[PDB]
Amino acid sequence: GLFGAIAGFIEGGWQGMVDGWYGYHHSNEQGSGYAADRESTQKAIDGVTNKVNSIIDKMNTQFEAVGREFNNLERRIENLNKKMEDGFLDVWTYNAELLVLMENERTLDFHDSNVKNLYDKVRLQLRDNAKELGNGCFEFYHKCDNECMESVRNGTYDYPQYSEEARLKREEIS
Amino acid sequence: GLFGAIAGFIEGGWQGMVDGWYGYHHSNEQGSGYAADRESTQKAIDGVTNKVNSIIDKMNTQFEAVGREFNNLERRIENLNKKMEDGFLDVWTYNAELLVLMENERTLDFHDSNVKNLYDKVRLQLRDNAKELGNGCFEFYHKCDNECMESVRNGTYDYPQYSEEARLKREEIS
Amino acid sequence: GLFGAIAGFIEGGWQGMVDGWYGYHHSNEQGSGYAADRESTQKAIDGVTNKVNSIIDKMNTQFEAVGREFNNLERRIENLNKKMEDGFLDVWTYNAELLVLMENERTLDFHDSNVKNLYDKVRLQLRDNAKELGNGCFEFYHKCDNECMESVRNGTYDYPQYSEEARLKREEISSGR
Amino acid sequence: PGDQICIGYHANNSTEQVDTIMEKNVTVTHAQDILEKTHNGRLCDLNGVKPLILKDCSVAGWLLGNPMCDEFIRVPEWSYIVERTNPANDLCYPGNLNDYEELKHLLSRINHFEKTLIIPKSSWPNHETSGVSAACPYQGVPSFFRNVVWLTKKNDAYPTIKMSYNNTNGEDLLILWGIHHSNNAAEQINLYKNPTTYVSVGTSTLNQRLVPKIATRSQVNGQQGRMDFFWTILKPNDAIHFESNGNFIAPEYAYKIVKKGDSTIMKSEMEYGHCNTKCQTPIGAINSSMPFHNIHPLTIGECPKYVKSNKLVLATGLRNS
Amino acid sequence: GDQICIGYHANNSTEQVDTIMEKNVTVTHAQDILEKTHNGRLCDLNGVKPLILKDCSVAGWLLGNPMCDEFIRVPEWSYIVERTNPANDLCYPGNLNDYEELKHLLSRINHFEKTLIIPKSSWPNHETSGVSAACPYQGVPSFFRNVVWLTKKNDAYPTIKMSYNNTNGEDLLILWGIHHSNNAAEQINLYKNPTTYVSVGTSTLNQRLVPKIATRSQVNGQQGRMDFFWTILKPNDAIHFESNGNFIAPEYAYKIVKKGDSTIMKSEMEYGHCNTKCQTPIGAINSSMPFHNIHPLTIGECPKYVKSNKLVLATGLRNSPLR
Amino acid sequence: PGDQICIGYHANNSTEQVDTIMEKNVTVTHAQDILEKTHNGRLCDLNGVKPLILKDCSVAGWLLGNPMCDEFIRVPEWSYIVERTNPANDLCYPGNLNDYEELKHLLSRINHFEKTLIIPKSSWPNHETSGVSAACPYQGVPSFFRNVVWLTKKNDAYPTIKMSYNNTNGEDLLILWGIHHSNNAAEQINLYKNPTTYVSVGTSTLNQRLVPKIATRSQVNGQQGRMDFFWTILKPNDAIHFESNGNFIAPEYAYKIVKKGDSTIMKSEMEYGHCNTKCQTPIGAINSSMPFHNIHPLTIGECPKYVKSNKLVLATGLRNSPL
Ligand SMILES: *[C@@H]1O[C@H](CO)[C@@H](O[C@@H]2O[C@H](CO)[C@@H](O[C@@H]3O[C@H](CO)[C@@H](O)[C@H](O)[C@@H]3O)[C@H](O)[C@H]2NC(C)=O)[C@H](O)[C@H]1NC(C)=O
Ligand SMILES: CC(=O)N[C@H]1[C@H]([C@H](O)[C@H](O)CO)O[C@@](O[C@@H]2[C@@H](O)[C@H](O)O[C@H](CO)[C@@H]2O)(C(=O)O)C[C@@H]1O
Ligand SMILES: *[C@@H]1O[C@H](CO)[C@@H](O)[C@H](O)[C@H]1NC(C)=O
Ligand SMILES: *[C@@H]1O[C@H](CO)[C@@H](O)[C@H](O)[C@H]1NC(C)=O
Numbered sequence A, B: 001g002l003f004g005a006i007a008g009f010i011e012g013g014w015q016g017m018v019d020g021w022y023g024y025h026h027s028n029e030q031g032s033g034y035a036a037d038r039e040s041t042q043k044a045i046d047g048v049t050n051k052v053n054s055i056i057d058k059m060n061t062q063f064e065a066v067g068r069e070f071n072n073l074e075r076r077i078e079n080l081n082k083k084m085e086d087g088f089l090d091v092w093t094y095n096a097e098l099l100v101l102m103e104n105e106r107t108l109d110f111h112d113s114n115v116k117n118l119y120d121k122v123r124l125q126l127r128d129n130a131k132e133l134g135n136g137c138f139e140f141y142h143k144c145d146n147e148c149m150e151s152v153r154n155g156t157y158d159y160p161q162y163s164e165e166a167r168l169k170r171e172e173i174s
Numbered sequence C: 001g002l003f004g005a006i007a008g009f010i011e012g013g014w015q016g017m018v019d020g021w022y023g024y025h026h027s028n029e030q031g032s033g034y035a036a037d038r039e040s041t042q043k044a045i046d047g048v049t050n051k052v053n054s055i056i057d058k059m060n061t062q063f064e065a066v067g068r069e070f071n072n073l074e075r076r077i078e079n080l081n082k083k084m085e086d087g088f089l090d091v092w093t094y095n096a097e098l099l100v101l102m103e104n105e106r107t108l109d110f111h112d113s114n115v116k117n118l119y120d121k122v123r124l125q126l127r128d129n130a131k132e133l134g135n136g137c138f139e140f141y142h143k144c145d146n147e148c149m150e151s152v153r154n155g156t157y158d159y160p161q162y163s164e165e166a167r168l169k170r171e172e173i174s175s176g177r
Numbered sequence D: 001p002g003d004q005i006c007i008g009y010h011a012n013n014s015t016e017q018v019d020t021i022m023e024k025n026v027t028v029t030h031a032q033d034i035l036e037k038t039h040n041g042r043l044c045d046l047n048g049v050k051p052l053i054l055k056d057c058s059v060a061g062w063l064l065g066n067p068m069c070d071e072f073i074r075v076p077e078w079s080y081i082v083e084r085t086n087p088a089n090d091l092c093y094p095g096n097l098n099d100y101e102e103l104k105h106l107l108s109r110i111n112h113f114e115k116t117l118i119i120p121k122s123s124w125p126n127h128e129t130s131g132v133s134a135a136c137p138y139q140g141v142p143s144f145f146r147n148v149v150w151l152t153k154k155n156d157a158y159p160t161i162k163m164s165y166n167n168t169n170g171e172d173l174l175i176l177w178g179i180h181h182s183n184n185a186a187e188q189i190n191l192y193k194n195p196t197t198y199v200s201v202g203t204s205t206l207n208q209r210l211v212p213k214i215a216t217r218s219q220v221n222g223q224q225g226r227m228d229f230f231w232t233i234l235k236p237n238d239a240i241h242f243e244s245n246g247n248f249i250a251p252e253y254a255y256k257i258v259k260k261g262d263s264t265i266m267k268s269e270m271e272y273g274h275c276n277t278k279c280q281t282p283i284g285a286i287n288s289s290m291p292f293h294n295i296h297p298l299t300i301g302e303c304p305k306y307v308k309s310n311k312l313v314l315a316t317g318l319r320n321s
Numbered sequence E: 001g002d003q004i005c006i007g008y009h010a011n012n013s014t015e016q017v018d019t020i021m022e023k024n025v026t027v028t029h030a031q032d033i034l035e036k037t038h039n040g041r042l043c044d045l046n047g048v049k050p051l052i053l054k055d056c057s058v059a060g061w062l063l064g065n066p067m068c069d070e071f072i073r074v075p076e077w078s079y080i081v082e083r084t085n086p087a088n089d090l091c092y093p094g095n096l097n098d099y100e101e102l103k104h105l106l107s108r109i110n111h112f113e114k115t116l117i118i119p120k121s122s123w124p125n126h127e128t129s130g131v132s133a134a135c136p137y138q139g140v141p142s143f144f145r146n147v148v149w150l151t152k153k154n155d156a157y158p159t160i161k162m163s164y165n166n167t168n169g170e171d172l173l174i175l176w177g178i179h180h181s182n183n184a185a186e187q188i189n190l191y192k193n194p195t196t197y198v199s200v201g202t203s204t205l206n207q208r209l210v211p212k213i214a215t216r217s218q219v220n221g222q223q224g225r226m227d228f229f230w231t232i233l234k235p236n237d238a239i240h241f242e243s244n245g246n247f248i249a250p251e252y253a254y255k256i257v258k259k260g261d262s263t264i265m266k267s268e269m270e271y272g273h274c275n276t277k278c279q280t281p282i283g284a285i286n287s288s289m290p291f292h293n294i295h296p297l298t299i300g301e302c303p304k305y306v307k308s309n310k311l312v313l314a315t316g317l318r319n320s321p322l323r
Numbered sequence F: 001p002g003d004q005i006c007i008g009y010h011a012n013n014s015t016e017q018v019d020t021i022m023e024k025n026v027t028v029t030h031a032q033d034i035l036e037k038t039h040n041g042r043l044c045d046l047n048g049v050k051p052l053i054l055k056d057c058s059v060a061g062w063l064l065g066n067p068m069c070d071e072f073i074r075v076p077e078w079s080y081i082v083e084r085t086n087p088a089n090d091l092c093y094p095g096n097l098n099d100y101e102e103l104k105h106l107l108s109r110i111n112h113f114e115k116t117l118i119i120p121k122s123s124w125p126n127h128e129t130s131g132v133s134a135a136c137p138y139q140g141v142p143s144f145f146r147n148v149v150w151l152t153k154k155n156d157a158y159p160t161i162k163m164s165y166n167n168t169n170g171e172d173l174l175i176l177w178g179i180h181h182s183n184n185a186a187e188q189i190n191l192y193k194n195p196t197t198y199v200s201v202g203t204s205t206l207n208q209r210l211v212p213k214i215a216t217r218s219q220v221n222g223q224q225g226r227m228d229f230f231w232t233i234l235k236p237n238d239a240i241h242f243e244s245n246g247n248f249i250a251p252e253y254a255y256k257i258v259k260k261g262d263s264t265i266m267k268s269e270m271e272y273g274h275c276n277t278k279c280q281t282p283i284g285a286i287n288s289s290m291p292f293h294n295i296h297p298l299t300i301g302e303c304p305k306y307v308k309s310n311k312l313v314l315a316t317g318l319r320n321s322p323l
């Protein structure tokens, strides 16, 4: 995709995540589990649904009567009808096929953008209190527990509360 | 396709920046104020106008005379013209609605990308001399006056003048 | 561009790199040279090739006979044919022209994105072991030989090994020495 | 040995595939088709109005009253007309119907239709009205069209006909009449006595004068003779003036016609399905909001646009792994 | 600590655009690429005034219906304006052969001049005073002004053999006709000769018409019919007339030069003294927009007609609330 | 200083330029054009079938057998008919061919064509078959159509013809006949001796009655008379019945005709190219897989879509940097 997340530095999706399109996986002392980001998922679901409906609802269908009303001595006019019908089929076939091709690439790159933005949202909270692993994961420096883990997904991560512990852990490795 | 800047980590626009589309707001000892970035603004305006002109000027129009020139004994021929006229209306209506829908999303992502690139360009200059607050703002560690502020806007920021001054301030942060 | 890599912080292409579309340039004590990223180059070449083929192959063409077979007492029907052929010319010209414009825009951002992804893959690897110059380059805070150079390219860079060496150089520039 | 939080995306067991402009055969978690491929395989009503199904007859054969057709029917309204690909019953006596294709388009959609007896056989006291032929059999017996009468000589005389019918009904009237072409001089004098004949029909707009063409012709349904029929729409309070001295196939029934919509003739071999639809094809009916379909090109109604394509699949989910 | 911030523009605009993924998105600037305004008047097309027939139809104007204008200037026109239901089409009941194909020819005419080709003085042995009550001028019977109702003189209708050679340098449009009698007695009472014929011949035309005597309905108080014909006579070619009764002699012809084509516009409006590149029956439109939704029946270089109320292109940024 | 690693992209000497939605004249390293603008400028076979090229003949003058037109040879099958815009030899004797355009559409694609003799000249023992006109010259000496026979009175008498030909061939037959229109009664009597005459034709579906229009007409090709020609398709095991007492242009040669596809008539002034093509234009043949072209609108075959475009250049490379 255009952005680096899906099939990029986040190599593959999560089969263990059945709720939501995007979310988090945590691993700490208490345990490990998945959690869906309902804000990102519902926003994406609404966006894709609008896209499909817009493609469907924008079609203006009219009452037409398509038949063969010309006899043997009117082949030229029948040929005129054939050229008209074939031209419309060529236009609609080409239009529908490439509209699907163009929108599918944009849809897959839409999911890629959403995952990367969610990754950036977490990265903004953590700052130097955690270390980026480069594969979509953050290694904590300050022993983040279950209540701590929720604050990252909530958006309520208390950075100054853990600055001292992370700093002392950062110097230990160095 | 969202890049996260507009309606993202930068929440809302400024009514006080009446000079350009993208710009900066600074705050120091000398005071505060807005400053448009001409380079990104003029580039965006030229590209957007090209889009509008490309959609308009690429349309080919030729002289046509459309009327009802058939009698009650040529209703089959009329239905052919009716089938043709309705067919072209459905092609143009579907294309115009979908092209506008597809390009409107492109334009909104274009503005989002420009703001993010503007944010990134500032960050590359400042490095550790300032800290990122996450809301699109940088807190300077060193003392940055109006002359300093103008250097960041036009890309002429001199990192090594304030490295020690920022380093001493950074270490002093207890 | 959209992602800011091409014509953004990275300025200009490399006339000296001919082995691929996206690559690296290194410079150390042993020397300097270019090395192409074969993965993203072939991935982008295949994607661009499919776009050209999709635009071509998806067109449905059928046999047609176009001519002027209406006499002087059938000018109205010829006018009907005249509107039909012109109407399809307007549809096809507008669709083909806009197709080129939108797709050329998207293709230019495809290369812009791929270069940015290559830059990020390196940046997250080096971290503070190297300094971002803001022009698409990384200045190493330690000695990085030819074997070290590939470790950045192939994604096997050993940060902890050079962490001590890189940390020493950071202080030297910090204290004005 | 440090705590970890990760960002990832959904994956499932879906094997659905989509195509992009750059990549083909990409497995996605969810996909939606926008191409219609299903029909009920039946002939339905169009917006609550039943179609006119001619089981084994053409429009010309049904209009003139071929004895092998269904007499008449209690359908005063239809949205479209159904015909088989090769109808068995048509003009049983060989001949032509003028403006047949235009007439078929006129009757494609009809609000009100009613057969009306406008000239009974009792209105022909000086002429014989029992004309029948072997080319128009009924239960193996020679017969004729049930709505038009073969006027022939009686008592060795064919007096000149001056007849006018005024349209007293409040609706438009569709009237059919024909002329007969003989094969030899003896046949003409046999059937109509008078050797030189004509048919003169006149209305507010119509001014016709047909002359029989007596010549050697190939046999069709056994008869070398031919019968060319004609039609017109008699406006309310307008009178049609017939004037002939032989070879005249005089109208006996007519048709009250009210038209406010248009349609076409559908060539389908199916049968009625006691259903309703907004879109009809010769092989079935469609319900759909999908913008495209690949079922049949010869549709009637509000239908998806016809394309040549086996699938139009839109990716709704994520890139699966 | 000093701070610098990144941000974007916002204003008081309430303009809304739609994207493929979102609906009713407020932006700062926008452009409408759909044309929806017309001046509501009939203009010239590329500087050429149209032919406007207020109460008259094409057949009546050409043939010379007395209640139609005798002749107004308009030596050339870009298109023809006809009323939906013209009041005076054919005073004497009848038909005009290939009326639609003739209307298409006269849609755009580079030069139009009425010419006298056969004066009334060229019928020395035929009475040329025929009139009808279905064709009234000022309350008295009259006839078409460009054709002559030839009747018998001194109980005699000599067989006519008259030819006209087109000496003009431009094409000539000539209209003639045949009269249908109500009965055999009326045929004798008008043209004497019982079995009549009208035969017309040119380099490409070879015509022979026979009157059809029958009983018909009464139209405009008359029961007979007058079927009219026409042809385009090239320069240096002659048209040959030959009849012994029921002949409608042509008196006035029409010099014609054709350089382009147009169509017939059914409109109830009148002249507006304006100029336009695209005309519709309810008004003219002046725009460079690629799409319009005003009327399908257009003449000229026009935007593509679409079924849509608005096509708004977002040019600004996504907008923020009041603060 | 310090060791460095840099991220970059390719560049070359290409000056190729593409257009995007937002930018104009953008140089790229590699580009591909999807618009076809080249042709061989020759008349090729359409899927291996040779076209029927009438070098100086209209279609009508070719079936009827114009004396200055049979420079042609046997072409049993063709894929389209190539006519010049203004063929020299259309109809040597002035007249018309009924339903000419529909007949031309019929013969555009023919699976099998074979001229066959159906009525030899010996089949008129009591009629004159040596009718010859100066309007139909061959090598200067007057001649006539080679496939039809001008029947003239013999021994001061024109016996009434009652002739029937049955299509015993297993293919359909294209039969052409005609009627001669005279200018005066003396010409009628001197040629056919019967003042009032008729030509009646009958088949399983056709029922025709033609009467000459003895009238004065403008001279064409030296003749004031005309010859109206008619055609029909005779189904296998069917017979056509002719009954005439004068002015009959009897058929001599017929055509065994099999139709399996449809085409059109191409107006071009070029010659054969001994080549094969999938798409043919009046100015040359196209061998391309591209979806669009701007060569010629009047195409025959499986062709790309016609557009008004100088170039449709897709960007297949990176944004190039100047040297
Ligand atoms: C209607 O009247 C005009 C006025 O004279 C006739 O003029 C025709 O004009 C043409 C062009 O000047 C003459 O053609 C010339 O004739 C010779 C053959 O003699 C030819 O070699 C030249 O190339 C040249 O074109 C034509 O002869 C002349 N016609 C006559 C009868 O003298 C015109 O013919 C008249 N229309 C008809 C249908 O007769
Ligand atoms: C030039 C001429 O003879 N004009 C007649 C005219 C025609 O003879 C008639 O329209 C042919 O169909 O007819 C006029 O009206 C007549 C009535 O006044 C008369 O009562 O009945 C006549 C029927 O034979 C005929 O309708 C007319 O239009 O004024 C008489 C006029 O002299
Ligand atoms: C996929 O999983 C769902 C639920 O987990 C199950 O019902 C289904 O049978 C599985 N297979 C397919 C092919 O959908
Ligand atoms: C038919 O009868 C009505 C009765 O009101 C009469 O007014 C009308 O004129 C008649 N029609 C004709 C053509 O005479």
Ligand SMILES: *[C@@H]1O[C@H](CO)[C@@H](O)[C@H](O)[C@H]1NC(C)=O
Pocket: E023, E024
């Ligand atoms: C958008 O606004 C219009 C009127 O401004 C309203 O009718 C429509 O329902 C709105 N749509 C949505 C999705 O809010």
Ligand SMILES: *[C@@H]1O[C@H](CO)[C@@H](O)[C@H](O)[C@H]1NC(C)=O
Pocket: F024, F025
């Ligand atoms: C692009 O090049 C064309 C000539 O090929 C020139 O006319 C046009 O002005 C150029 N446009 C720009 C934006 O440079």
Ligand SMILES: *[C@@H]1O[C@H](CO)[C@@H](O)[C@H](O)[C@H]1NC(C)=O
Pocket: D217, D218, D219, F166, F167, F237, F238, F239
């Ligand atoms: C023509 O030949 C066929 C074949 O025997 C025969 O049935 C038919 O009667 C003949 N005549 C006509 C007029 O078709």
